[PDB]
Amino acid sequence: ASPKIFGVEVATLKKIIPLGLMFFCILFNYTILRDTKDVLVVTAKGSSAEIIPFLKTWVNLPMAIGFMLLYTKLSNVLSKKALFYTVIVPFIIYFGAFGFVMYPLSNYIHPEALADKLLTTLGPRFMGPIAILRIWSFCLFYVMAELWGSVVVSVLFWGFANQITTVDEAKKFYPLFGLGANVALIFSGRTVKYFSNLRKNLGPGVDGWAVSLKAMMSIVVGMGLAICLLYWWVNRYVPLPTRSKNKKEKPKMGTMESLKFLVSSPYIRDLATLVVAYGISINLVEVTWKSKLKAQFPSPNEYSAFMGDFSTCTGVATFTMMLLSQYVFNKYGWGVAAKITPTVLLLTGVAFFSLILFGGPFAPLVAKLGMTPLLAAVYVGALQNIFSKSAKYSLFDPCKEMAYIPLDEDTKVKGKAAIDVVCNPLGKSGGALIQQFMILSFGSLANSTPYLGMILLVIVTAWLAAAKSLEGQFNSLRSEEELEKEMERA
Amino acid sequence: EVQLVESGGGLVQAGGSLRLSCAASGFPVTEHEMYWYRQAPGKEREWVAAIDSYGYTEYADSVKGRFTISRDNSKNTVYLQMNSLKPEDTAVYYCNVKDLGAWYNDYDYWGQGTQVTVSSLE
């Protein structure tokens, strides 16, 4: 009988605290980079304003697809620890070198004298690519920062977690990772604010932005070394579940064969449907609700007063959703928690689009509440936007990562990479393409409200169906693997 | 810091055209939603037209069908074309940016405004 502190075994505690610290450090770096990259690529000595859109449209998704293909073969030819280090150490060393060498020597490595010769060579329509060349370093930083948030946060960390955590411990401790994730976001936001202020408070004659960037990248590399040390500690001094002996399988090593299996797998299909539908739903409904919001509050002061209260409610809901998620995971299981998000989004979206499309009929009904139907739509969309963003680290991400645990390591790792790197940017891109198609069809997103609502209905319906099928397959895998382990161990 | 400068406001006859231009600096102007407000003397500041990071161009009902907001990423500036102007469009127009992130301290940045006056002459 090993000792138990706080009602939890010391071994599980010893495996969970370093995981929580790793996730804290990872999201600390993620927030620092997510702010540094956009405050950096625009405040560059020579930088077009169409340099970030080009990196969001034509660079982000191809880079994600290329990283998926690279990671598949790397996992095929490397062990778990070797792959983790091979993926994360380049990020850490690049951010350190950028903070200490590449940014101070930015006038030296940037080909300003070449991407004006080639700008007289290639017409102004090619202003896009030329711009990146002109500040390639910073642009690479941007890309790498994006990749960090797409890879180190999702593939690296959560792959490690699903590799070392069982389904029971995942139900017990994944919401408590989101609590701590939010603390990392809070503290990293305060750190970014502190260094933004420090850039100005320090006296003249000093490149305050250079000092702030050096300090922020020093924190980035410190947290990265902390992540590496915690990974080494968990892999050395924590007894990890080995697997069920079904672990043996022919290594595919076919980047065509592996992808063909992933597209033909009914499990990855449903999981990718969840991810894609989540991204599309929040993006579309967020745009529509913000348009209605602007219509509601014409004055600046009222708009900002409402977006103080919205943030306060967002924080309160984040806290209460963390607690409620740790409760529902303990009590009802994976299926209920996986279906809570699409059902609530569906109900709130139906109410929202009903108050939008039919405001006339609903005017007497909402008048009982003392609200203009526009204001009712604003509040419904605000509550939906709150539930959808507060259930990420509490309700959606825990379910998504725990769906990976009962899989075999081949499919686990490969589907993790192919979903959390490629399918999520595809969700965002599909939402954008959907809205653009509605615009080109009907001239405006205001003239496409019924069709936007109908396609959102279809998307969340497919989300619910995928959640149901995924929960069925998830229970099937869990039962099969537990019975197989108990039969081979008997 | 964040800098927003408006231009193009002037004196035009009723039924005329006028193109406001907000030049922005110190933040990604293509990644945040850019607003256009107007304020008349004796009245509160009211919203005119916004454009999102995607360029989706939501307008106020008072100017819908006549005004057209358009962000040019090549020149890094937001634009507000005003066709079929009418004498109650006379106001000081501001371009606004909100919620710029943790690197910024105010949550609201404005320009100094540009005066647009529409004359009811015959």
Coordinates of C-alpha atoms in Angstrom, one line a residue:
Chain A
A1 CA 0.0 0.0 0.0
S2 CA 1.9 3.0 -1.3
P3 CA 1.1 6.3 0.5
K4 CA -1.6 8.5 -0.9
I5 CA -1.7 12.4 -0.7
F6 CA -4.9 14.3 -1.4
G7 CA -6.6 10.9 -2.0
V8 CA -4.4 10.2 -5.0
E9 CA -1.6 7.6 -5.2
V10 CA 2.0 9.0 -5.1
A11 CA 2.9 7.3 -8.4
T12 CA -0.1 8.9 -10.3
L13 CA 0.7 12.2 -8.6
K14 CA 4.4 11.8 -9.7
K15 CA 3.2 11.3 -13.2
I16 CA 0.6 14.1 -13.3
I17 CA 2.5 17.0 -11.6
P18 CA 5.3 17.0 -14.3
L19 CA 2.6 16.7 -17.0
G20 CA 0.8 19.7 -15.6
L21 CA 4.1 21.6 -15.4
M22 CA 4.9 20.7 -19.0
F23 CA 1.5 21.9 -20.2
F24 CA 1.9 25.1 -18.2
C25 CA 5.3 25.8 -19.8
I26 CA 4.1 24.8 -23.2
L27 CA 1.1 27.2 -23.2
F28 CA 3.3 29.9 -21.5
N29 CA 5.6 29.7 -24.5
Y30 CA 2.6 29.4 -26.8
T31 CA 1.1 32.7 -25.6
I32 CA 4.4 34.5 -25.6
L33 CA 5.1 33.5 -29.2
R34 CA 1.5 34.1 -30.3
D35 CA 1.8 37.7 -29.2
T36 CA 5.5 38.2 -30.2
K37 CA 5.1 36.9 -33.8
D38 CA 2.3 39.4 -34.7
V39 CA 3.8 42.3 -32.8
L40 CA 7.1 41.5 -34.5
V41 CA 6.3 40.8 -38.2
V42 CA 4.5 44.1 -38.5
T43 CA 7.1 46.2 -36.6
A44 CA 10.0 45.3 -38.9
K45 CA 12.4 47.5 -40.8
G46 CA 10.6 47.0 -44.1
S47 CA 7.4 44.9 -44.0
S48 CA 4.3 44.8 -46.2
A49 CA 0.9 44.7 -44.5
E50 CA 0.0 41.7 -46.7
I51 CA 2.7 39.6 -45.2
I52 CA 0.6 38.1 -42.4
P53 CA -2.4 37.2 -44.7
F54 CA -0.1 35.4 -47.2
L55 CA 1.3 33.4 -44.2
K56 CA -2.2 32.6 -43.1
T57 CA -3.6 31.6 -46.5
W58 CA -0.8 30.0 -48.5
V59 CA 1.9 29.1 -46.0
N60 CA 0.1 27.9 -42.9
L61 CA -1.7 24.9 -44.4
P62 CA 1.1 23.7 -46.7
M63 CA 3.5 23.9 -43.7
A64 CA 1.1 21.9 -41.6
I65 CA 0.7 19.2 -44.3
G66 CA 4.4 19.0 -44.8
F67 CA 4.9 18.6 -41.1
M68 CA 2.4 15.8 -41.1
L69 CA 4.3 14.0 -43.8
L70 CA 7.6 14.6 -42.0
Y71 CA 6.3 13.5 -38.6
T72 CA 4.9 10.3 -40.0
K73 CA 8.2 9.1 -41.3
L74 CA 10.1 10.4 -38.2
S75 CA 7.9 8.4 -36.0
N76 CA 8.4 5.4 -38.3
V77 CA 12.2 5.7 -38.0
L78 CA 12.6 7.0 -34.4
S79 CA 11.7 6.0 -30.9
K80 CA 9.2 7.9 -28.7
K81 CA 11.8 10.0 -26.8
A82 CA 14.0 10.5 -29.8
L83 CA 11.0 11.8 -31.8
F84 CA 9.9 14.1 -29.0
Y85 CA 13.3 15.6 -28.7
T86 CA 13.8 15.8 -32.5
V87 CA 10.6 17.7 -32.8
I88 CA 10.9 20.1 -29.8
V89 CA 14.6 20.9 -29.5
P90 CA 14.6 22.6 -33.0
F91 CA 11.9 24.9 -31.8
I92 CA 13.7 25.8 -28.6
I93 CA 17.0 26.4 -30.2
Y94 CA 15.5 28.4 -33.0
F95 CA 13.6 30.7 -30.6
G96 CA 16.8 31.2 -28.5
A97 CA 18.9 31.9 -31.6
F98 CA 16.2 34.3 -32.9
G99 CA 16.1 36.2 -29.6
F100 CA 19.9 36.4 -29.3
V101 CA 21.4 36.2 -32.8
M102 CA 18.8 36.3 -35.6
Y103 CA 17.0 39.5 -34.4
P104 CA 20.2 41.5 -33.4
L105 CA 21.7 40.4 -36.7
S106 CA 18.5 41.0 -38.7
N107 CA 20.0 43.7 -41.0
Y108 CA 22.7 41.2 -42.0
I109 CA 20.7 38.0 -42.8
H110 CA 17.8 39.6 -44.6
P111 CA 18.2 40.0 -48.4
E112 CA 16.9 43.5 -48.7
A113 CA 19.4 44.1 -51.6
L114 CA 18.0 41.0 -53.4
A115 CA 14.3 41.3 -52.9
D116 CA 14.2 44.7 -54.7
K117 CA 16.2 43.5 -57.7
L118 CA 13.8 40.6 -57.9
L119 CA 10.9 43.1 -57.3
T120 CA 12.0 45.0 -60.4
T121 CA 12.2 41.6 -62.0
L122 CA 8.8 40.3 -60.9
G123 CA 5.7 42.6 -61.1
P124 CA 3.9 44.1 -58.2
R125 CA 1.4 41.3 -58.2
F126 CA 4.2 39.2 -56.6
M127 CA 4.5 41.6 -53.7
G128 CA 3.4 38.7 -51.5
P129 CA 6.3 36.3 -51.7
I130 CA 8.9 39.0 -52.1
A131 CA 7.8 40.5 -48.8
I132 CA 8.5 37.2 -47.0
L133 CA 12.0 37.0 -48.5
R134 CA 12.7 40.5 -47.3
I135 CA 12.0 39.5 -43.7
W136 CA 12.3 35.7 -44.1
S137 CA 13.7 35.3 -40.5
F138 CA 10.7 37.0 -38.8
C139 CA 8.4 35.2 -41.2
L140 CA 9.9 31.9 -40.3
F141 CA 9.5 32.9 -36.6
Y142 CA 5.8 33.6 -37.4
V143 CA 5.4 30.2 -39.0
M144 CA 7.4 28.4 -36.3
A145 CA 5.3 30.1 -33.6
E146 CA 2.1 28.9 -35.4
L147 CA 3.7 25.4 -35.7
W148 CA 4.5 25.4 -32.0
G149 CA 0.8 26.1 -31.1
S150 CA -0.2 23.4 -33.6
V151 CA 2.5 20.8 -32.7
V152 CA 4.1 21.2 -29.3
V153 CA 0.8 22.0 -27.7
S154 CA -1.3 19.3 -29.4
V155 CA 0.9 16.6 -31.1
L156 CA 3.9 16.6 -28.8
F157 CA 2.4 17.1 -25.3
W158 CA -0.9 15.4 -25.8
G159 CA 0.7 12.5 -27.6
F160 CA 3.1 12.1 -24.6
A161 CA 0.1 12.3 -22.3
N162 CA -2.0 9.7 -24.1
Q163 CA 1.1 7.6 -24.3
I164 CA 1.7 7.6 -20.6
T165 CA -1.8 8.2 -19.2
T166 CA -4.6 5.6 -19.0
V167 CA -8.2 6.4 -19.8
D168 CA -9.2 6.5 -16.1
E169 CA -6.3 8.9 -15.1
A170 CA -7.2 10.9 -18.2
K171 CA -10.8 11.3 -17.0
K172 CA -9.5 12.3 -13.6
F173 CA -6.7 14.7 -14.6
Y174 CA -7.3 16.2 -18.1
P175 CA -9.6 19.0 -16.9
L176 CA -7.0 19.7 -14.2
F177 CA -4.6 20.2 -17.1
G178 CA -6.9 22.9 -18.5
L179 CA -6.9 24.4 -15.1
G180 CA -3.3 25.4 -15.2
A181 CA -3.5 25.9 -18.9
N182 CA -5.7 28.9 -18.2
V183 CA -3.2 29.9 -15.5
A184 CA -0.4 29.7 -18.0
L185 CA -2.4 31.9 -20.4
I186 CA -3.0 34.4 -17.6
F187 CA 0.6 34.5 -16.4
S188 CA 2.0 34.7 -20.0
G189 CA -0.4 37.5 -20.8
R190 CA 0.9 39.4 -17.7
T191 CA 4.5 38.6 -18.8
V192 CA 3.8 40.0 -22.3
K193 CA 2.2 43.1 -20.7
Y194 CA 5.2 43.5 -18.4
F195 CA 7.7 43.4 -21.2
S196 CA 5.6 45.7 -23.4
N197 CA 5.6 48.2 -20.6
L198 CA 9.4 47.6 -19.9
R199 CA 10.1 48.3 -23.6
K200 CA 8.9 51.9 -22.9
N201 CA 10.0 52.4 -19.2
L202 CA 13.7 51.9 -19.9
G203 CA 15.6 55.1 -20.7
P204 CA 16.6 56.4 -24.1
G205 CA 19.5 55.2 -26.2
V206 CA 18.5 51.5 -25.5
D207 CA 16.6 49.3 -28.0
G208 CA 13.8 48.5 -25.6
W209 CA 12.1 46.2 -28.1
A210 CA 15.4 44.3 -28.5
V211 CA 15.7 43.9 -24.7
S212 CA 12.1 42.8 -24.3
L213 CA 12.5 40.3 -27.1
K214 CA 15.7 38.9 -25.6
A215 CA 14.0 38.5 -22.2
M216 CA 10.8 36.9 -23.7
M217 CA 12.9 34.5 -25.7
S218 CA 15.0 33.7 -22.6
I219 CA 11.8 32.8 -20.9
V220 CA 10.8 30.7 -23.9
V221 CA 14.0 28.7 -23.8
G222 CA 13.9 28.4 -20.0
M223 CA 10.4 26.9 -20.2
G224 CA 11.6 24.8 -23.1
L225 CA 14.5 23.4 -21.1
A226 CA 11.9 22.9 -18.3
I227 CA 9.8 20.9 -20.7
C228 CA 12.7 18.8 -21.8
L229 CA 13.8 18.1 -18.2
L230 CA 10.3 17.2 -17.2
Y231 CA 10.0 14.9 -20.2
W232 CA 13.3 13.2 -19.2
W233 CA 12.1 12.9 -15.6
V234 CA 8.8 11.3 -16.5
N235 CA 10.5 8.9 -18.9
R236 CA 13.1 7.9 -16.4
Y237 CA 11.7 8.0 -12.9
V238 CA 8.0 7.2 -13.6
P239 CA 6.9 3.6 -14.2
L240 CA 4.8 3.8 -17.3
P241 CA 2.1 1.5 -18.7
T242 CA 3.9 -0.6 -21.2
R243 CA 1.0 -1.7 -23.5
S244 CA -1.2 -4.7 -24.3
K245 CA 0.8 -7.2 -26.3
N246 CA -1.1 -6.3 -29.5
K247 CA 1.6 -3.6 -29.7
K248 CA 3.4 -5.6 -32.5
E249 CA 2.4 -4.5 -36.0
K250 CA 4.2 -4.3 -39.3
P251 CA 5.7 -0.7 -39.5
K252 CA 4.0 0.8 -42.5
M253 CA 6.7 3.4 -43.4
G254 CA 4.6 4.2 -46.4
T255 CA 3.6 7.8 -46.3
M256 CA 1.1 6.8 -49.0
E257 CA 0.2 3.6 -47.1
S258 CA -0.2 5.2 -43.7
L259 CA -2.3 8.0 -45.1
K260 CA -4.4 5.6 -47.0
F261 CA -5.1 3.7 -43.8
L262 CA -5.9 6.9 -41.9
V263 CA -8.4 8.0 -44.6
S264 CA -9.9 4.5 -44.5
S265 CA -10.1 4.4 -40.7
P266 CA -13.6 5.0 -39.3
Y267 CA -12.1 6.3 -36.1
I268 CA -9.9 9.1 -37.5
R269 CA -12.9 10.1 -39.7
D270 CA -15.1 10.8 -36.8
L271 CA -12.4 12.4 -34.8
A272 CA -11.4 14.7 -37.7
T273 CA -15.1 15.5 -38.1
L274 CA -15.3 16.6 -34.4
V275 CA -12.2 18.9 -34.9
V276 CA -13.3 20.3 -38.2
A277 CA -16.9 20.9 -37.1
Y278 CA -15.8 22.6 -33.9
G279 CA -13.5 25.0 -35.8
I280 CA -16.1 25.8 -38.5
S281 CA -18.9 26.3 -36.0
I282 CA -17.2 28.7 -33.7
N283 CA -15.7 30.7 -36.6
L284 CA -19.0 31.2 -38.5
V285 CA -21.2 31.8 -35.4
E286 CA -18.6 34.2 -34.0
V287 CA -18.5 36.3 -37.2
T288 CA -22.4 36.4 -37.3
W289 CA -22.7 37.3 -33.6
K290 CA -20.1 40.0 -33.9
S291 CA -21.9 41.6 -36.8
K292 CA -25.2 41.6 -34.8
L293 CA -23.2 43.0 -31.8
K294 CA -22.0 45.9 -33.8
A295 CA -25.5 46.5 -34.9
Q296 CA -26.6 46.5 -31.3
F297 CA -24.1 48.9 -29.6
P298 CA -23.6 51.9 -31.9
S299 CA -21.6 53.9 -29.4
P300 CA -18.0 53.1 -28.5
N301 CA -18.4 53.4 -24.7
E302 CA -21.3 50.9 -24.6
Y303 CA -19.5 48.5 -26.9
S304 CA -16.4 48.5 -24.6
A305 CA -18.6 48.3 -21.5
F306 CA -20.2 45.2 -23.0
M307 CA -16.8 43.8 -23.8
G308 CA -15.7 44.2 -20.3
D309 CA -18.7 42.3 -19.0
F310 CA -18.3 39.7 -21.7
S311 CA -14.8 39.0 -20.6
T312 CA -15.8 38.8 -16.9
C313 CA -18.5 36.3 -17.8
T314 CA -16.0 34.4 -20.0
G315 CA -13.6 34.1 -17.0
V316 CA -16.4 33.0 -14.6
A317 CA -17.6 30.5 -17.1
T318 CA -14.1 29.2 -17.7
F319 CA -13.7 28.5 -14.0
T320 CA -17.2 26.9 -13.6
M321 CA -16.7 24.9 -16.8
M322 CA -13.4 23.5 -15.4
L323 CA -15.2 22.4 -12.3
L324 CA -18.3 21.1 -14.1
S325 CA -16.0 19.2 -16.6
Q326 CA -14.1 17.5 -13.9
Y327 CA -17.5 16.5 -12.5
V328 CA -19.1 15.3 -15.7
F329 CA -16.0 13.3 -16.7
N330 CA -16.1 11.5 -13.3
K331 CA -19.8 10.8 -13.4
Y332 CA -21.2 10.5 -16.9
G333 CA -18.2 9.5 -18.9
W334 CA -16.7 10.3 -22.3
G335 CA -19.8 10.1 -24.4
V336 CA -21.9 12.6 -22.4
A337 CA -19.0 15.1 -22.2
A338 CA -18.2 14.6 -25.9
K339 CA -21.9 15.4 -26.9
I340 CA -22.4 18.3 -24.5
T341 CA -20.5 20.8 -26.7
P342 CA -22.3 20.1 -30.0
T343 CA -25.8 19.9 -28.3
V344 CA -25.3 23.2 -26.5
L345 CA -23.9 24.9 -29.6
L346 CA -26.8 23.5 -31.6
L347 CA -29.5 24.8 -29.2
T348 CA -27.9 28.2 -28.8
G349 CA -27.3 28.5 -32.5
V350 CA -30.9 27.6 -33.3
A351 CA -32.1 30.2 -30.8
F352 CA -29.6 32.8 -32.2
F353 CA -30.5 32.3 -35.8
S354 CA -34.2 32.2 -35.0
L355 CA -34.0 35.6 -33.3
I356 CA -32.0 36.8 -36.3
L357 CA -34.1 35.4 -39.2
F358 CA -37.5 35.9 -37.5
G359 CA -37.2 39.0 -35.4
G360 CA -40.7 40.2 -36.2
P361 CA -42.6 37.2 -34.8
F362 CA -40.2 37.0 -31.8
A363 CA -40.5 40.7 -30.9
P364 CA -43.5 40.2 -28.6
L365 CA -41.9 37.1 -27.1
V366 CA -38.6 38.9 -26.3
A367 CA -40.5 42.0 -25.1
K368 CA -41.5 40.1 -22.0
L369 CA -37.7 40.0 -21.2
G370 CA -37.3 43.7 -21.8
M371 CA -35.0 43.2 -24.8
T372 CA -35.0 44.2 -28.5
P373 CA -34.8 40.9 -30.6
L374 CA -31.4 42.2 -31.7
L375 CA -30.3 42.4 -28.1
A376 CA -31.7 38.9 -27.5
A377 CA -29.7 37.6 -30.4
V378 CA -26.6 39.5 -29.1
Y379 CA -27.0 37.8 -25.7
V380 CA -27.7 34.3 -27.1
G381 CA -24.6 34.6 -29.4
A382 CA -22.6 35.8 -26.5
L383 CA -23.5 32.9 -24.3
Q384 CA -22.8 30.5 -27.2
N385 CA -19.4 32.1 -27.9
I386 CA -18.7 31.8 -24.1
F387 CA -19.6 28.1 -23.9
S388 CA -17.7 27.3 -27.1
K389 CA -14.4 29.0 -25.9
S390 CA -14.7 27.9 -22.2
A391 CA -15.3 24.2 -23.2
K392 CA -12.0 24.0 -25.1
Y393 CA -9.6 23.2 -22.3
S394 CA -12.4 21.8 -20.0
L395 CA -14.7 19.8 -22.2
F396 CA -13.6 19.5 -25.8
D397 CA -9.9 19.0 -25.6
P398 CA -10.1 16.4 -22.8
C399 CA -12.5 14.3 -24.9
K400 CA -10.5 14.7 -28.0
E401 CA -7.2 13.6 -26.4
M402 CA -8.8 10.7 -24.5
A403 CA -10.3 9.4 -27.7
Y404 CA -6.7 8.7 -28.8
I405 CA -5.8 6.6 -25.7
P406 CA -7.3 3.1 -26.5
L407 CA -5.9 3.2 -30.0
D408 CA -2.8 1.2 -31.0
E409 CA 0.4 3.3 -31.0
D410 CA 0.8 3.3 -34.8
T411 CA -2.7 4.7 -35.4
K412 CA -2.6 6.7 -32.2
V413 CA 0.5 8.7 -33.1
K414 CA -0.2 9.0 -36.8
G415 CA -3.8 10.1 -36.5
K416 CA -2.8 12.5 -33.7
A417 CA -0.4 14.1 -36.1
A418 CA -2.7 14.1 -39.1
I419 CA -5.6 15.5 -37.1
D420 CA -4.1 18.1 -34.7
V421 CA -1.8 19.5 -37.4
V422 CA -3.8 19.3 -40.6
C423 CA -7.5 18.8 -39.8
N424 CA -7.8 21.8 -37.5
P425 CA -6.4 24.3 -40.0
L426 CA -8.6 22.6 -42.6
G427 CA -11.6 23.4 -40.3
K428 CA -10.6 27.1 -40.2
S429 CA -10.0 27.2 -43.9
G430 CA -13.3 25.4 -44.6
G431 CA -15.2 27.9 -42.5
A432 CA -13.5 30.8 -44.3
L433 CA -14.3 29.2 -47.7
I434 CA -17.9 28.6 -46.7
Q435 CA -18.4 32.2 -45.8
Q436 CA -16.7 33.4 -49.0
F437 CA -18.9 31.1 -51.0
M438 CA -22.0 32.5 -49.3
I439 CA -20.7 36.0 -50.1
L440 CA -20.0 35.3 -53.8
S441 CA -23.4 33.6 -54.1
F442 CA -25.5 36.3 -52.3
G443 CA -23.3 39.4 -52.2
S444 CA -23.3 39.6 -48.4
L445 CA -23.1 37.6 -45.2
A446 CA -26.3 39.4 -44.2
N447 CA -28.0 38.1 -47.4
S448 CA -26.8 34.5 -46.6
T449 CA -28.1 34.2 -43.0
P450 CA -30.6 31.4 -43.7
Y451 CA -28.1 29.4 -45.7
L452 CA -25.4 30.0 -43.1
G453 CA -27.8 28.7 -40.5
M454 CA -28.7 25.7 -42.6
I455 CA -25.1 24.7 -43.2
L456 CA -24.2 25.3 -39.6
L457 CA -27.1 23.0 -38.7
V458 CA -25.7 20.3 -41.1
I459 CA -22.2 20.8 -39.7
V460 CA -23.2 20.4 -36.1
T461 CA -25.5 17.5 -37.0
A462 CA -22.5 15.7 -38.6
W463 CA -20.6 16.7 -35.4
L464 CA -23.2 15.0 -33.2
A465 CA -23.3 11.9 -35.5
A466 CA -19.5 11.7 -35.4
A467 CA -19.5 12.1 -31.6
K468 CA -22.0 9.2 -31.3
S469 CA -20.1 6.9 -33.7
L470 CA -16.8 7.8 -32.0
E471 CA -18.1 7.1 -28.6
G472 CA -19.3 3.7 -29.7
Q473 CA -16.0 2.9 -31.3
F474 CA -14.2 4.2 -28.2
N475 CA -16.1 2.0 -25.9
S476 CA -15.5 -0.9 -28.3
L477 CA -11.7 -0.3 -28.3
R478 CA -11.5 0.1 -24.5
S479 CA -13.5 -3.1 -23.8
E480 CA -11.5 -5.1 -26.4
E481 CA -8.1 -4.0 -25.2
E482 CA -9.0 -4.5 -21.5
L483 CA -10.3 -8.0 -22.1
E484 CA -7.3 -8.8 -24.3
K485 CA -4.8 -7.6 -21.6
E486 CA -6.7 -9.6 -18.9
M487 CA -6.7 -12.7 -21.1
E488 CA -3.0 -12.5 -21.9
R489 CA -2.1 -11.8 -18.3
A490 CA -4.3 -14.6 -16.8
Chain B
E1 CA 2.6 52.8 -30.1
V2 CA -0.6 52.6 -32.1
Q3 CA -1.2 55.4 -34.6
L4 CA -4.4 56.0 -36.6
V5 CA -4.6 59.0 -39.0
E6 CA -7.7 59.9 -41.0
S7 CA -7.9 61.8 -44.2
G8 CA -10.3 62.6 -47.1
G9 CA -12.9 64.5 -45.1
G10 CA -14.0 67.8 -46.5
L11 CA -16.9 70.0 -47.9
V12 CA -19.1 68.3 -50.5
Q13 CA -22.5 69.1 -51.8
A14 CA -25.6 67.0 -50.9
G15 CA -25.6 64.0 -53.1
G16 CA -21.8 63.9 -53.5
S17 CA -19.1 61.4 -52.9
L18 CA -16.2 61.4 -50.4
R19 CA -13.6 58.8 -49.7
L20 CA -12.2 58.6 -46.2
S21 CA -8.8 56.8 -45.6
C22 CA -7.5 55.6 -42.2
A23 CA -3.8 54.9 -42.3
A24 CA -2.9 52.6 -39.4
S25 CA 0.5 51.8 -37.8
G26 CA 1.8 49.9 -34.8
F27 CA -0.3 46.7 -35.1
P28 CA -1.5 44.1 -37.7
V29 CA -4.2 46.1 -39.4
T30 CA -5.3 43.1 -41.5
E31 CA -5.7 40.8 -38.5
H32 CA -8.1 43.0 -36.4
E33 CA -11.5 44.5 -37.1
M34 CA -11.3 48.1 -38.1
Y35 CA -14.2 50.3 -37.2
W36 CA -15.5 53.7 -38.5
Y37 CA -17.4 55.9 -36.1
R38 CA -18.7 59.4 -36.5
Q39 CA -19.6 62.1 -34.0
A40 CA -21.6 65.3 -34.6
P41 CA -21.4 68.3 -32.3
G42 CA -24.1 67.9 -29.6
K43 CA -24.5 64.2 -30.3
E44 CA -22.8 61.1 -29.1
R45 CA -20.2 59.1 -31.1
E46 CA -22.0 56.6 -33.3
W47 CA -20.8 53.7 -35.4
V48 CA -20.8 53.9 -39.2
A49 CA -19.1 50.9 -40.7
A50 CA -16.6 48.1 -39.8
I51 CA -14.5 45.6 -41.6
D52 CA -13.4 42.3 -40.1
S53 CA -10.0 40.5 -40.4
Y54 CA -11.6 38.5 -43.2
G55 CA -12.9 41.7 -44.9
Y56 CA -16.6 41.1 -44.4
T57 CA -17.8 44.7 -44.3
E58 CA -20.6 45.1 -41.8
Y59 CA -22.4 48.5 -42.1
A60 CA -24.8 50.6 -40.1
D61 CA -28.3 50.8 -41.4
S62 CA -28.1 54.6 -41.6
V63 CA -25.4 54.3 -44.3
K64 CA -26.1 50.8 -45.7
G65 CA -26.3 50.9 -49.5
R66 CA -24.4 54.2 -49.8
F67 CA -21.1 53.7 -47.9
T68 CA -18.5 51.0 -48.7
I69 CA -15.7 50.1 -46.3
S70 CA -12.7 48.4 -47.8
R71 CA -9.3 47.5 -46.3
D72 CA -6.3 47.6 -48.7
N73 CA -3.6 45.4 -47.3
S74 CA -1.1 46.5 -50.0
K75 CA -1.2 50.1 -48.7
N76 CA -2.1 49.0 -45.2
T77 CA -5.1 51.4 -45.0
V78 CA -8.8 51.2 -44.4
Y79 CA -11.2 53.1 -46.7
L80 CA -14.7 54.4 -46.5
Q81 CA -16.3 55.4 -49.8
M82 CA -19.4 57.6 -49.3
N83 CA -21.7 57.9 -52.3
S84 CA -25.0 59.9 -52.4
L85 CA -24.0 61.9 -49.3
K86 CA -26.8 63.7 -47.4
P87 CA -26.6 66.7 -45.1
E88 CA -26.9 64.7 -41.9
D89 CA -23.7 62.9 -42.7
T90 CA -21.8 66.0 -41.5
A91 CA -19.7 64.9 -38.5
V92 CA -16.1 64.1 -37.4
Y93 CA -15.2 60.6 -38.5
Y94 CA -12.9 58.4 -36.5
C95 CA -11.3 55.1 -37.3
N96 CA -11.0 52.8 -34.3
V97 CA -9.3 49.6 -33.4
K98 CA -10.1 47.5 -30.3
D99 CA -8.8 44.5 -28.4
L100 CA -5.4 44.6 -29.9
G101 CA -3.9 42.0 -27.5
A102 CA -1.7 41.9 -24.5
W103 CA 1.0 44.1 -26.1
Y104 CA -1.3 47.1 -25.8
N105 CA -2.6 49.0 -22.8
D106 CA -5.8 50.8 -23.8
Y107 CA -8.2 48.4 -25.6
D108 CA -9.3 51.4 -27.8
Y109 CA -7.3 53.4 -30.3
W110 CA -8.7 56.3 -32.2
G111 CA -7.5 58.8 -34.8
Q112 CA -7.8 62.5 -34.4
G113 CA -10.9 62.5 -36.7
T114 CA -11.6 64.1 -40.0
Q115 CA -14.4 66.6 -40.6
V116 CA -17.0 65.8 -43.3
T117 CA -19.5 68.6 -44.0
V118 CA -22.4 68.2 -46.5
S119 CA -23.9 71.4 -47.8
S120 CA -27.6 71.8 -48.5
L121 CA -27.1 74.5 -51.2
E122 CA -29.3 74.8 -54.4

